[PDB]
Design a protein around this ligand. Structure first.
Ligand SMILES: Nc1ncnc2c1ncn2[C@@H]1O[C@H](COP(=O)(O)OP(=O)(O)OP(=O)(O)O)[C@@H](O)[C@H]1O
Ligand SMILES: Nc1ncnc2c1ncn2[C@@H]1O[C@H](COP(=O)(O)OP(=O)(O)OP(=O)(O)O)[C@@H](O)[C@H]1O
Ligand SMILES: [Zn+2]
Ligand SMILES: [Zn+2]
Lengths: 139, 76, 468, 139, 69, 76
């Protein structure tokens, strides 16, 4: 795997994300004492070839985590409707051995807009993701 | 005092029986450990079937001798 | 690698189904458009027309050869006939190198759809004689408890099912077990040590342990009625405790195949059960297990449940990761899609059926083992037929102290009699191998006189006459 | 079977394309102690009748490698996303045998530019091919 | 036939053409007559939305071989 | 010389005999270590009952040759 200091030029966004996903993961304190629940979701975007898939593997390796990887086009390619069970077992097995990081790579290939819908299995996986995202309010 | 009852699967069952009791009490003691009724049970002592109405002294069964246990229903 | 002699014969034949001209054909007489083209042997539409419920795996091997080998270049010879794995690859070819810390979708086992297997390895089990298995039920008629056995037999072609192998059995061996009225459970260590020496004598006689039988009768009142009806449509077909014993027996005996990458695939093993029909008799039935899902998950995840139709699914302890199991069933209002977020999933879905039968008595190719079928068996200690050398004065005796060779050789071809003689090992192993080959093969008259002229057979009848 | 002498006229393009197939396979030690990674993709394009599939079969039989063929209009499914499962099936089968070479002819037929379609499954077909080639860490 | 084997659900047409060349090789000499090939092989135009694939490409990989006298 | 004295129950015990010795020395050796009187000591070689008053030269008993002993068991 890749290290931690193998990224240059992105130092400003690194310090934005080191306090966001690395510091509350290793420290359950200083958020209950301050009375603020930590955020349970971040979104990275920009031009391609800028370090989207590289920075996520770098920030999760040398911190101590579970690092549940899940790819975009690899889901929804199943038959008889089992992509929801592969998503429900993804979030259930992560919280059993907390702390965990669920990195959903290429999320644009999973959730398009409702005016460009295709078939019926595309609606079934965007509403499963919106329901299961709200279930992580138990800290 | 000591006795050794062995089935056909190569499993010996330990049991502590009195030297001057009946054979029916031996079939009752092996009933409590497993849950097999003693009506279909039969005891073979070196090719000789032990009768339940007799005792341990007339058959000359000595201490910790190897016994045999087999199941055979009367009507079945 | 070399496969069986029966398996290579089914591979060479194409097994095409011819058709005739029809009114729908618009072509000439010297041709075929689509309606009189040769039918493939793997089409399931022709199968359910003749009430064949499976597609005869050697034809299923042909339908995957068309997908592996194509008209294009390819240059591969992949032949994707392998056991689908539900275990987790540890190396994972990604950044989540330990499974304690990390698992992604390319190594995660997918959710089991529970689709039924469309192909069976053994297509039709057949028997040799109705007097052979009559002794097996007679063991229950004396001690009143259930029995157990192992079936030794061979294989040959089957012309009823298109590209199908039929299962022939010759003799039944019983291991020493502890009987019980409710069920049965024996030690696997003393059986495996006993079955190792029976496989020695089965090699020279041409036999192989390919089956097993266990009884389940529950007699009603011993009068007009024969047995109760335990296994029906609403009840269980096979109990989940006997699925475990059927799964371990198939993994111990693999079937060699050149098309598989590991060298072994599609085990040819039969499990027969004596259970009785619905109405009034003790008619038997046989089903074998499925290779696609059940054969691999039995190494890690099969746990016993209190229900005979279902089996409990246990939990993961740091290496035993299992996926969710789904199946479709009807609710109180309608028919719905997959509901199972609950343990104790049924095991009757993972069984494929067989067609049992007995051949006609007027003609056959051979029978090879019908001597008496009344000799006392080797490990029938619950019954009274477990005799010493006193039986050999009663059974054969070199009949009436001077026996005719047409009446002496007809008794010597018994399976359990020959397996009782060599345990004493009086004869030489070279003279014993020609003794069992004379009893099982034809033109035995020139070699039987060689046996009676040998000094080993003379010492056998002399040591028997002085003893009781 | 055809060979290297089976086609002429493109002798400059023959010696150019022979560097990127022989050097990653015959002598891979030149990529060691130089820091860089050997590339994977070679792109040929031209008018039909120029011998694109002829040059692909000539370089396969002259090296004895595990050649594979992926066709354009063949693997393009509409059932449940089976094209996304059959592309990764061909990649793991080529990874099981070393050395290997795959060939994808008429690559414009499989997921073209989104100036016309822009909403079909071909948007998620090409993104499957992005993460499949980038995850080829087997040197 | 043209409009007969192309009206299937894109799965049996590629096996019917595989059965067509295999049966003609078994009983050589043989001819293969097809009609209405425009219904099987149309052109690519601005009105996309048809199947237009998986059948003619099967005919491309079947016809370029088989020339071993 | 080395011989293989094997009884009817398959128990083979190694004994000693001379190539020109009588069979009564073998019958006396069974009477020592097994305690069997000669009315139940029945040896059989080559399909013939070996008489107690003969030698090994008549039956051609050689080195490392097996022997078949029969022991009488009766209730009366
Ligand atoms: N600081 C950096 N910023 C951008 N790219 C980098 C940096 N350092 C190295 N790279 C190179 O860029 C590649 C990583 O790019 P990445 O995989 O994130 O593509 P992306 O377009 O950013 O995201 P995606 O993978 O989703 O397309 C590496 O192979 C690496 O050689
Ligand atoms: N060295 C060569 N250069 C150019 N053409 C050649 C050469 N040798 C043979 N040819 C001819 O050119 C044709 C090669 O065309 P090919 O089969 O590659 O079609 P293609 O359209 O390039 O393939 P694809 O369908 O993969 O694009 C052959 O039919 C052959 O007669
Ligand atoms: Zn026709
Ligand atoms: Zn993995």
């Amino acid at each position: 795997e890749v290290g931690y200091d193998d990224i240059g030029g992105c130092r400003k966004q690194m310090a934005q994300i080191r306090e966001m996903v690395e510091l509350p993961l290793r420290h359950p304190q200083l958020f209950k004492a301050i009375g603020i629940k930590p955020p349970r979701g971040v979104l990275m975007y920009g031009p391609p070839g800028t370090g989207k898939t590289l920075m996520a593997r770098a920030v999760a390796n040398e911190t101590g985590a579970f690092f549940f990887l899940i790819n975009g086009p690899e889901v929804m390619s199943k038959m008889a409707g089992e992509s929801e069970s592969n998503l429900r077992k993804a979030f259930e097995e992560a919280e059993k051995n907390a702390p965990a990081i669920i990195f959903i790579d290429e999320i644009d290939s999973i959730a398009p807009k409702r005016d460009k819908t295709n078939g019926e299995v595309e609606r079934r996986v965007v509403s499963q993701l919106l329901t299961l995202m709200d279930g992580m309010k138990a800290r | 005092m000591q006795i050794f009852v062995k089935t056909l699967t190569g499993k010996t069952i330990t049991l502590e029986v009195e030297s001057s009791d009946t054979i029916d009490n031996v079939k009752s003691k092996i009933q409590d450990k497993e849950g097999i009724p003693p009506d279909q049970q039969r005891l073979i002592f070196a090719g000789k079937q032990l009768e339940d109405g007799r005792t341990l002294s007339d058959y000359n069964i000595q201490k910790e001798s190897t016994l045999h246990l087999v199941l055979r229903l009367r009507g079945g | 690698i070399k496969e069986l002699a029966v398996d290579e014969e089914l591979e060479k034949e194409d097994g095409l189904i011819p058709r005739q001209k029809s009114k729908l054909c618009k072509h000439g007489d010297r041709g075929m458009c689509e309606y009189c083209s040769p039918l493939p042997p793997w089409d399931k539409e022709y199968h359910e027309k003749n009430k064949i419920k499976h597609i005869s795996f050697h034809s299923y091997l042909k339908k995957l050869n068309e997908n592996a080998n194509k008209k294009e270049n390819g240059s591969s010879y992949i032949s994707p006939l392998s056991e689908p794995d539900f275990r987790i690859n540890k190396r994972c070819h990604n950044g989540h190198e330990p499974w304690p810390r990390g698992i992604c979708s390319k190594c995660q086992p997918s959710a089991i759809t529970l689709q039924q297997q469309e192909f069976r390895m053994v297509d039709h089990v057949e028997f040799q004689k109705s007097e052979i298995i009559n002794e097996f039920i007679q063991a229950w008629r004396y001690t009143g408890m259930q029995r157990f056995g192992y079936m030794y037999g061979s294989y040959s072609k089957y012309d009823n099912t298109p590209l199908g192998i039929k299962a022939v059995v010759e003799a039944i061996y019983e291991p020493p077990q502890h009987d019980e009225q409710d069920g049965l459970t024996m030690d696997v260590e003393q059986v495996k040590n006993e079955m190792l020496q029976i496989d020695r004598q089965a090699q020279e006689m041409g036999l192989s342990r390919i089956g097993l039988i266990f009884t389940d009768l529950s007699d009603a009142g011993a009068g007009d009625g024969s047995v109760f009806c335990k296994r029906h449509k609403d009840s269980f077909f096979l109990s989940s405790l006997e699925v475990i014993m059927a799964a371990r027996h198939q993994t111990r005996h693999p079937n060699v195949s050149k098309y598989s990458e590991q060298g072994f695939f599609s085990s040819k093993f039969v499990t027969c059960v004596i259970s009785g029909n619905l109405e009034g008799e003790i008619d038997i039935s046989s089903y074998q297990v499925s290779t696609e899902a059940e054969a691999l998950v039995t190494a890690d995840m099969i746990s016993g449940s209190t229900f005979p139709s279902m089996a409990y699914i246990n939990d993961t302890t740091d290496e035993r990761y299992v996926p969710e199991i789904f199946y479709m069933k009807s609710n109180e209002y309608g028919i719905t899609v997959k509901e199972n977020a609950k343990p104790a999933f049924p095991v009757d879905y993972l069984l494929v059926t067989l067609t049992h039968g007995f051949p006609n008595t007027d003609t056959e190719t051979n029978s090879k083992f019908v001597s008496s079928t009344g000799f006392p068996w080797s490990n029938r200690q619950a019954m009274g037929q477990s005799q010493d050398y006193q039986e050999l004065k009663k059974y054969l005796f070199n009949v009436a102290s001077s026996g005719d060779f047409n009446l002496l050789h007809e008794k010597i071809s018994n399976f359990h009699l020959l397996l009782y003689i060599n345990s004493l090992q009086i004869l030489s192993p070279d003279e014993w191998k020609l003794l069992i080959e004379s009893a099982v093969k034809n033109e035995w008259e020139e070699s039987l006189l060689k046996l009676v002229s040998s000094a080993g057979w003379q010492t056998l009848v002399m040591i028997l006459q002085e003893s009781g």
